Short mmCIF file of C-alpha atoms and ligand atoms in Angstrom, two decimals:
data_model
loop_
_atom_site.label_atom_id
_atom_site.label_comp_id
_atom_site.label_asym_id
_atom_site.label_seq_id
_atom_site.Cartn_x
_atom_site.Cartn_y
_atom_site.Cartn_z
CA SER A 1 102.64 104.14 78.62
CA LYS A 2 102.56 105.53 82.18
CA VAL A 3 102.23 109.30 82.59
CA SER A 4 105.28 111.35 83.58
CA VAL A 5 104.71 113.03 86.96
CA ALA A 6 106.69 115.71 88.79
CA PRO A 7 108.24 116.49 91.13
CA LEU A 8 109.80 113.26 92.35
CA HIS A 9 110.65 114.83 95.71
CA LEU A 10 107.03 114.21 96.68
CA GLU A 11 108.20 110.60 97.14
CA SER A 12 110.86 111.56 99.68
CA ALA A 13 108.79 112.28 102.78
CA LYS A 14 108.96 109.54 105.41
CA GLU A 15 105.71 110.48 107.20
CA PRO A 16 102.40 111.65 105.74
CA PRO A 17 101.71 115.37 105.99
CA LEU A 18 99.18 116.06 108.70
CA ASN A 19 97.36 119.23 109.70
CA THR A 20 99.80 121.46 107.81
CA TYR A 21 97.10 124.13 107.92
CA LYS A 22 94.58 124.46 110.71
CA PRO A 23 91.16 126.14 110.76
CA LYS A 24 92.62 129.10 112.66
CA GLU A 25 94.84 130.00 109.66
CA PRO A 26 93.74 128.09 106.55
CA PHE A 27 95.55 128.05 103.23
CA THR A 28 93.92 130.20 100.56
CA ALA A 29 93.90 127.98 97.47
CA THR A 30 92.42 128.71 94.04
CA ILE A 31 89.88 126.80 91.95
CA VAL A 32 91.21 125.56 88.61
CA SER A 33 88.04 123.90 87.29
CA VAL A 34 84.69 122.39 88.24
CA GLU A 35 82.90 119.85 86.05
CA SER A 36 79.89 117.59 86.49
CA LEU A 37 80.75 113.90 86.63
CA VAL A 38 77.25 112.50 86.12
CA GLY A 39 74.48 112.16 83.59
CA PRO A 40 70.96 113.59 83.60
CA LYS A 41 69.39 110.52 85.24
CA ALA A 42 71.71 110.70 88.24
CA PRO A 43 69.77 111.45 91.48
CA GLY A 44 72.04 114.38 92.32
CA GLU A 45 74.94 116.25 90.77
CA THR A 46 78.37 115.10 91.79
CA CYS A 47 81.16 117.39 90.62
CA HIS A 48 84.93 117.12 90.19
CA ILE A 49 86.79 120.13 91.60
CA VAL A 50 90.44 120.83 90.83
CA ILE A 51 92.20 123.04 93.39
CA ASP A 52 95.58 124.74 92.94
CA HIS A 53 97.45 124.63 96.27
CA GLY A 54 100.76 125.60 94.58
CA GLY A 55 102.64 122.79 96.34
CA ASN A 56 101.90 124.31 99.76
CA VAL A 57 99.43 121.63 100.90
CA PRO A 58 100.87 118.32 99.72
CA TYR A 59 99.22 115.09 100.75
CA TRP A 60 99.32 111.35 100.33
CA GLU A 61 96.69 109.26 98.62
CA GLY A 62 93.80 108.44 100.91
CA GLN A 63 93.93 111.69 102.85
CA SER A 64 91.28 114.39 103.13
CA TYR A 65 91.23 118.15 102.72
CA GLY A 66 89.16 120.36 104.91
CA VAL A 67 87.23 123.22 103.33
CA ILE A 68 85.86 126.17 105.33
CA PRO A 69 82.92 127.65 103.35
CA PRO A 70 82.47 131.40 103.52
CA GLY A 71 79.99 133.04 105.83
CA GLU A 72 79.26 133.00 109.54
CA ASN A 73 78.63 129.95 111.69
CA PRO A 74 74.79 129.82 111.79
CA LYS A 75 74.91 128.45 115.34
CA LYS A 76 77.78 130.75 116.43
CA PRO A 77 77.44 134.36 115.23
CA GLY A 78 80.68 136.19 114.60
CA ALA A 79 82.38 132.81 114.02
CA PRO A 80 83.53 131.16 110.77
CA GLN A 81 81.86 128.08 109.39
CA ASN A 82 82.91 124.64 110.51
CA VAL A 83 85.33 122.61 108.40
CA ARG A 84 83.85 120.06 106.03
CA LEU A 85 86.19 117.23 105.12
CA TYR A 86 86.47 115.83 101.59
CA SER A 87 88.42 112.75 100.58
CA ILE A 88 91.02 113.70 98.01
CA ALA A 89 90.26 112.08 94.64
CA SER A 90 93.68 112.75 93.08
CA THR A 91 97.16 111.37 93.52
CA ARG A 92 99.78 113.43 95.30
CA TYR A 93 100.77 114.78 91.87
CA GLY A 94 97.20 115.81 91.03
CA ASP A 95 95.29 115.80 87.79
CA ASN A 96 97.89 118.01 86.01
CA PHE A 97 100.80 115.74 87.12
CA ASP A 98 102.79 118.62 88.59
CA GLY A 99 102.19 118.42 92.34
CA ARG A 100 100.35 121.77 92.30
CA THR A 101 96.71 120.67 92.46
CA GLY A 102 94.40 118.30 94.23
CA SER A 103 90.91 117.21 93.33
CA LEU A 104 87.69 116.63 95.21
CA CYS A 105 84.67 114.52 94.27
CA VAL A 106 81.66 116.38 95.70
CA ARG A 107 77.97 115.45 95.85
CA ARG A 108 75.70 118.50 96.03
CA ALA A 109 73.58 118.24 99.17
CA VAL A 110 70.14 119.44 98.02
CA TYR A 111 66.96 119.50 100.11
CA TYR A 112 63.62 118.42 98.69
CA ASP A 113 60.44 118.69 100.67
CA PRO A 114 59.50 115.02 101.13
CA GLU A 115 55.85 115.58 100.19
CA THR A 116 55.89 118.28 97.48
CA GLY A 117 59.30 117.41 96.00
CA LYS A 118 59.80 121.16 96.33
CA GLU A 119 63.44 122.20 96.40
CA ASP A 120 64.52 124.71 99.06
CA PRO A 121 68.00 126.16 98.53
CA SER A 122 67.98 127.65 102.04
CA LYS A 123 68.24 124.08 103.32
CA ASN A 124 70.91 122.91 100.87
CA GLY A 125 74.36 121.85 102.03
CA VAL A 126 76.55 124.93 102.36
CA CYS A 127 79.96 123.57 101.48
CA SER A 128 79.00 121.05 98.83
CA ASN A 129 77.08 123.63 96.85
CA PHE A 130 79.75 126.27 97.46
CA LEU A 131 82.27 123.90 95.90
CA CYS A 132 80.18 122.75 92.93
CA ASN A 133 79.13 126.37 92.27
CA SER A 134 82.78 127.45 92.16
CA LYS A 135 84.48 128.82 89.05
CA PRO A 136 88.08 129.09 87.89
CA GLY A 137 89.89 131.71 89.95
CA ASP A 138 87.60 131.48 92.99
CA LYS A 139 89.39 131.17 96.34
CA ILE A 140 88.97 128.19 98.71
CA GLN A 141 89.98 128.09 102.40
CA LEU A 142 91.81 124.77 102.82
CA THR A 143 92.87 122.92 105.97
CA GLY A 144 94.66 119.66 106.57
CA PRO A 145 95.51 117.36 105.02
CA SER A 146 94.08 114.85 107.50
CA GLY A 147 93.65 111.13 107.82
CA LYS A 148 95.86 108.09 108.20
CA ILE A 149 93.38 105.19 108.04
CA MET A 150 93.18 105.23 104.25
CA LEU A 151 96.87 105.59 103.48
CA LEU A 152 97.95 102.99 100.95
CA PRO A 153 100.36 100.34 102.32
CA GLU A 154 103.15 100.24 99.73
CA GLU A 155 105.64 97.92 101.48
CA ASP A 156 104.46 95.04 99.23
CA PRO A 157 104.09 96.31 95.63
CA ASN A 158 102.44 92.99 94.74
CA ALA A 159 99.84 93.23 97.53
CA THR A 160 96.11 92.71 96.99
CA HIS A 161 93.84 95.74 97.60
CA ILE A 162 90.06 95.24 97.64
CA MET A 163 88.37 98.63 97.41
CA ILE A 164 84.68 99.04 98.33
CA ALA A 165 83.06 102.39 97.56
CA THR A 166 79.58 103.87 97.58
CA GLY A 167 79.10 107.11 95.63
CA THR A 168 81.75 109.75 96.33
CA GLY A 169 83.43 107.21 98.58
CA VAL A 170 85.22 106.27 95.36
CA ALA A 171 87.45 109.36 95.82
CA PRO A 172 90.48 107.74 97.55
CA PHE A 173 90.39 104.81 95.13
CA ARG A 174 90.73 107.09 92.11
CA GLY A 175 93.95 108.24 93.75
CA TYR A 176 95.12 104.69 94.59
CA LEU A 177 94.40 103.44 91.09
CA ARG A 178 96.10 106.35 89.30
CA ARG A 179 99.18 105.69 91.40
CA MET A 180 99.01 101.96 90.72
CA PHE A 181 98.30 102.11 86.97
CA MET A 182 98.39 105.59 85.40
CA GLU A 183 101.41 107.48 86.72
CA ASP A 184 105.09 106.75 86.16
CA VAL A 185 106.20 106.37 89.78
CA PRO A 186 109.53 104.54 89.82
CA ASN A 187 109.43 103.82 93.53
CA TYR A 188 106.02 102.08 93.33
CA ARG A 189 105.59 99.55 90.53
CA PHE A 190 102.35 97.81 91.44
CA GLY A 191 102.21 94.18 90.36
CA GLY A 192 99.42 92.88 92.61
CA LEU A 193 95.63 92.67 92.40
CA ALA A 194 93.48 95.79 92.79
CA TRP A 195 89.74 95.06 92.89
CA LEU A 196 87.30 97.96 92.90
CA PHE A 197 83.68 97.48 93.94
CA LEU A 198 81.59 100.55 93.22
CA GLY A 199 77.97 101.09 94.16
CA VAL A 200 76.05 103.98 92.59
CA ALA A 201 72.40 104.69 91.86
CA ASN A 202 72.42 104.09 88.10
CA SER A 203 74.71 104.10 85.08
CA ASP A 204 74.43 107.90 84.84
CA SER A 205 75.68 108.14 88.45
CA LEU A 206 78.94 106.38 87.64
CA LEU A 207 82.04 108.31 88.67
CA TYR A 208 85.23 107.97 86.63
CA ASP A 209 83.90 104.86 84.86
CA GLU A 210 85.89 105.45 81.66
CA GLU A 211 89.11 105.70 83.66
CA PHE A 212 88.48 102.45 85.56
CA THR A 213 87.40 100.70 82.39
CA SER A 214 90.70 101.72 80.79
CA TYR A 215 92.65 99.94 83.54
CA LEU A 216 90.53 96.85 82.91
CA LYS A 217 91.70 96.82 79.31
CA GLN A 218 95.29 97.86 80.01
CA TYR A 219 95.93 95.76 83.16
CA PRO A 220 93.54 92.79 82.91
CA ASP A 221 95.74 90.62 85.13
CA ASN A 222 96.01 93.24 87.90
CA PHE A 223 92.68 95.10 88.02
CA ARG A 224 89.12 93.91 88.55
CA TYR A 225 86.05 96.08 88.54
CA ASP A 226 82.52 95.33 89.71
CA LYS A 227 79.57 97.70 89.87
CA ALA A 228 76.36 97.67 91.92
CA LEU A 229 73.74 99.87 90.25
CA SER A 230 71.17 100.03 93.02
CA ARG A 231 68.30 101.46 90.97
CA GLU A 232 68.99 99.49 87.77
CA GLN A 233 69.80 96.02 89.17
CA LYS A 234 68.27 93.59 91.66
CA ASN A 235 70.13 91.26 94.00
CA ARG A 236 69.43 87.55 94.50
CA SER A 237 66.54 88.38 96.85
CA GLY A 238 64.94 90.96 94.55
CA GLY A 239 66.16 93.95 96.55
CA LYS A 240 68.34 96.77 95.31
CA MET A 241 71.81 95.63 94.21
CA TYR A 242 74.18 97.19 96.77
CA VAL A 243 77.93 96.61 97.02
CA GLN A 244 77.39 94.06 99.78
CA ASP A 245 75.43 91.96 97.30
CA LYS A 246 78.23 92.14 94.73
CA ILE A 247 80.73 91.19 97.44
CA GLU A 248 78.48 88.26 98.26
CA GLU A 249 78.83 87.03 94.67
CA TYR A 250 82.60 86.78 95.20
CA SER A 251 82.51 86.18 98.93
CA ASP A 252 84.43 82.90 98.78
CA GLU A 253 87.21 84.46 96.65
CA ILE A 254 87.42 87.59 98.80
CA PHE A 255 87.65 85.64 102.07
CA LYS A 256 90.49 83.63 100.50
CA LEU A 257 92.25 86.82 99.46
CA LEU A 258 91.84 88.17 102.99
CA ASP A 259 93.32 84.95 104.42
CA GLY A 260 96.32 85.46 102.12
CA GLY A 261 96.98 88.95 103.47
CA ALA A 262 94.88 91.21 101.22
CA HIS A 263 93.95 94.73 102.32
CA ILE A 264 90.30 95.70 102.21
CA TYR A 265 89.11 99.32 102.16
CA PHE A 266 85.68 100.84 102.75
CA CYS A 267 84.77 104.42 101.86
CA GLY A 268 81.44 106.14 101.47
CA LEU A 269 78.15 105.64 103.29
CA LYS A 270 78.39 104.21 106.80
CA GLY A 271 75.15 102.38 106.04
CA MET A 272 76.88 99.86 103.82
CA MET A 273 78.99 98.44 106.65
CA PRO A 274 76.44 96.29 108.52
CA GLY A 275 75.48 94.56 105.26
CA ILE A 276 79.07 93.99 104.27
CA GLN A 277 79.89 92.66 107.72
CA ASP A 278 76.88 90.33 107.57
CA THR A 279 78.08 89.02 104.21
CA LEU A 280 81.63 88.26 105.38
CA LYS A 281 80.40 86.75 108.65
CA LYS A 282 78.26 84.27 106.72
CA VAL A 283 81.36 83.15 104.83
CA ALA A 284 83.43 82.82 108.00
CA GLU A 285 80.75 80.85 109.76
CA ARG A 286 80.20 78.69 106.68
CA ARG A 287 83.88 77.82 107.13
CA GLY A 288 83.39 77.12 110.84
CA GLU A 289 85.18 80.30 111.94
CA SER A 290 84.23 83.09 114.33
CA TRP A 291 83.87 86.30 112.35
CA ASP A 292 84.58 88.27 115.51
CA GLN A 293 87.99 86.61 115.82
CA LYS A 294 88.77 86.92 112.10
CA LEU A 295 87.87 90.62 112.01
CA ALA A 296 89.99 91.25 115.09
CA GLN A 297 92.88 89.48 113.36
CA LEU A 298 92.38 91.49 110.16
CA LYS A 299 92.58 94.72 112.16
CA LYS A 300 95.64 93.55 114.11
CA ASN A 301 97.36 92.64 110.81
CA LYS A 302 96.42 96.16 109.49
CA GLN A 303 94.33 94.77 106.61
CA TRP A 304 91.05 96.51 107.50
CA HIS A 305 90.65 100.14 106.41
CA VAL A 306 87.34 101.92 107.09
CA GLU A 307 86.45 105.57 106.48
CA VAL A 308 82.69 106.03 106.20
CA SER A 309 80.30 108.77 107.33
C1 FAD B 401 86.47 112.16 106.39
C2 FAD B 401 85.33 112.61 105.51
C3 FAD B 401 85.47 112.67 104.13
C4 FAD B 401 84.41 113.09 103.32
N1 FAD B 401 84.48 112.96 101.99
C5 FAD B 401 83.52 113.43 101.16
C6 FAD B 401 83.64 113.43 99.71
O1 FAD B 401 84.69 113.00 99.16
N2 FAD B 401 82.60 113.90 98.99
C7 FAD B 401 81.48 114.35 99.54
O2 FAD B 401 80.58 114.76 98.78
N3 FAD B 401 81.28 114.38 100.88
C8 FAD B 401 82.26 113.94 101.70
N4 FAD B 401 82.10 114.01 103.08
C9 FAD B 401 80.95 114.78 103.57
C10 FAD B 401 81.30 116.26 103.66
O3 FAD B 401 82.24 116.47 104.69
C11 FAD B 401 80.07 117.12 104.00
O4 FAD B 401 79.48 116.69 105.23
C12 FAD B 401 79.01 117.08 102.92
O5 FAD B 401 79.56 117.60 101.73
C13 FAD B 401 77.81 117.99 103.23
O6 FAD B 401 78.27 119.21 103.80
P1 FAD B 401 77.57 120.60 103.40
O7 FAD B 401 78.33 121.76 103.97
O8 FAD B 401 77.23 120.56 101.93
O9 FAD B 401 76.12 120.44 104.11
P2 FAD B 401 75.70 121.12 105.48
O10 FAD B 401 75.46 122.59 105.23
O11 FAD B 401 76.68 120.69 106.54
O12 FAD B 401 74.25 120.48 105.68
C14 FAD B 401 74.18 119.11 106.12
C15 FAD B 401 72.93 118.52 105.51
O13 FAD B 401 71.82 119.10 106.17
C16 FAD B 401 70.86 119.52 105.21
N5 FAD B 401 70.10 120.61 105.83
C17 FAD B 401 70.57 121.82 106.21
N6 FAD B 401 69.57 122.54 106.77
C18 FAD B 401 68.46 121.77 106.76
C19 FAD B 401 67.07 121.86 107.20
N7 FAD B 401 66.67 123.00 107.78
N8 FAD B 401 66.23 120.83 107.01
C20 FAD B 401 66.62 119.70 106.43
N9 FAD B 401 67.89 119.54 105.99
C21 FAD B 401 68.82 120.50 106.14
C22 FAD B 401 71.68 119.88 103.97
O14 FAD B 401 70.80 119.80 102.86
C23 FAD B 401 72.77 118.81 104.04
O15 FAD B 401 72.32 117.57 103.48
C24 FAD B 401 83.12 113.51 103.92
C25 FAD B 401 82.98 113.46 105.31
C26 FAD B 401 84.03 113.02 106.12
C27 FAD B 401 83.85 113.00 107.62
N1 NAP B 402 86.15 109.49 103.92
C1 NAP B 402 84.85 109.50 104.08
O1 NAP B 402 84.40 109.33 105.22
C2 NAP B 402 83.95 109.75 102.91
C3 NAP B 402 84.42 110.02 101.62
C4 NAP B 402 83.52 110.25 100.59
C5 NAP B 402 82.17 110.21 100.87
N2 NAP B 402 81.75 110.02 102.12
C6 NAP B 402 80.32 109.99 102.38
O2 NAP B 402 79.80 108.91 101.63
C7 NAP B 402 78.51 109.20 101.14
C8 NAP B 402 78.53 109.08 99.63
O3 NAP B 402 77.19 109.21 99.20
P1 NAP B 402 76.75 109.83 97.80
O4 NAP B 402 75.78 110.93 98.14
O5 NAP B 402 77.93 110.06 96.91
O6 NAP B 402 76.04 108.47 97.32
P2 NAP B 402 74.49 108.07 97.17
O7 NAP B 402 74.13 108.29 95.73
O8 NAP B 402 73.68 108.59 98.34
O9 NAP B 402 74.64 106.48 97.40
C9 NAP B 402 75.61 105.75 96.66
C10 NAP B 402 75.11 104.35 96.40
O10 NAP B 402 75.05 103.64 97.64
C11 NAP B 402 73.73 103.11 97.76
N3 NAP B 402 73.32 102.87 99.16
C12 NAP B 402 72.42 103.56 99.89
N4 NAP B 402 72.27 103.00 101.10
C13 NAP B 402 73.07 101.93 101.15
C14 NAP B 402 73.40 100.90 102.15
N5 NAP B 402 72.80 100.91 103.37
N6 NAP B 402 74.28 99.97 101.80
C15 NAP B 402 74.86 99.96 100.59
N7 NAP B 402 74.62 100.86 99.63
C16 NAP B 402 73.74 101.85 99.86
C17 NAP B 402 72.80 104.07 97.02
O11 NAP B 402 71.60 103.44 96.61
P3 NAP B 402 70.11 104.08 96.69
O12 NAP B 402 70.32 105.58 96.73
O13 NAP B 402 69.47 103.55 95.44
O14 NAP B 402 69.52 103.57 97.99
C18 NAP B 402 73.70 104.37 95.83
O15 NAP B 402 73.61 103.31 94.89
C19 NAP B 402 78.18 110.60 101.63
O16 NAP B 402 77.49 110.50 102.87
C20 NAP B 402 79.54 111.21 101.89
O17 NAP B 402 79.46 112.24 102.86
C21 NAP B 402 82.59 109.77 103.14
MG1 MG B 403 78.53 108.96 82.93
#
């Protein structure tokens, strides 16, 4: 039932591609499609952008593309805009299974006057709105790919991977999970446990929910899926249900998975990390263990993968 992908030679590279294109001479790619991923009650629009790179900017799952929006640097006249990085939300074969496209998961950065609620498009985010405003056939200046922290360790195809995302931080995990469960990749037959924790504002802010729910039904012994809907659910203390609260629910089980060698990944808002770290520390110290030492050991054993901003 897995999807045929091509071309298999994307499996042959021994090292991840890195900085194939640089800001000084970006690759001119072409938009294939842009679609909203969210419902009307979502607090902002998050869009899914499919980009045709023609096979010229291949990548591994977990990497990022840079995008240079058009225009001049506002704080450097005569100069191009700075690169904005976006975690790639597709597998190396991309959403058309042909190794020609990659996808981004982009939240429109929109400014509202805090008192009047008044929108002001002059203060909106340049690149995020450029991308979600794009249309088929538009050109995109691409750099990269970049990133090694979030590469998926594939040495053990029965490994455990605990994936913790807030909002568009889900992007790399869509790529991981498609590779683990959707695509017919003969050199990676995942037989382990993948456990996605996703925190979003409300049910309408869910990103790729139908896809992840399909893995639940198709691979119930290998995929688990927990959601923290911050504006629809309350945690034990009556505060907003964030991912660190959902982790807390399973904290015993997670710590045991981590002691057995599981990988844990964090992507999204940097603000979630103190709360997550506080949750795991409580479990360690419950057990009589120094969290500082355990975290240092997790990093030395390459189990601890953080890319937040
Ligand atoms: C490794 C990495 C991966 C990333 N992955 C993703 C991803 O997958 N998806 C994603 O959506 N983002 C991601 N980001 C963030 C992304 O790189 C951009 O920073 C983000 O999209 C906003 O950039 P922008 O060009 O839209 O906004 P910018 O134009 O850079 O503006 C920055 C912010 O300032 C605000 N602003 C501008 N002028 C004013 C003003 N005068 N007063 C008040 N506010 C103002 C804008 O509204 C915006 O919120 C990632 C970041 C990193 C480092
Ligand atoms: N590789 C990377 O570095 C990477 C990749 C993708 C995205 N990002 C970054 O990740 C962020 C994604 O944000 P978004 O705009 O898509 O999401 P968002 O809607 O701003 O937030 C996502 C969810 O996280 C919750 N949240 C807010 N503060 C939190 C905290 N301190 N701890 C835990 N949860 C918290 C939000 O709840 P409330 O809004 O109800 O408070 C919401 O439910 C962006 O800043 C983006 O630039 C980075
Ligand atoms: Mg929806």
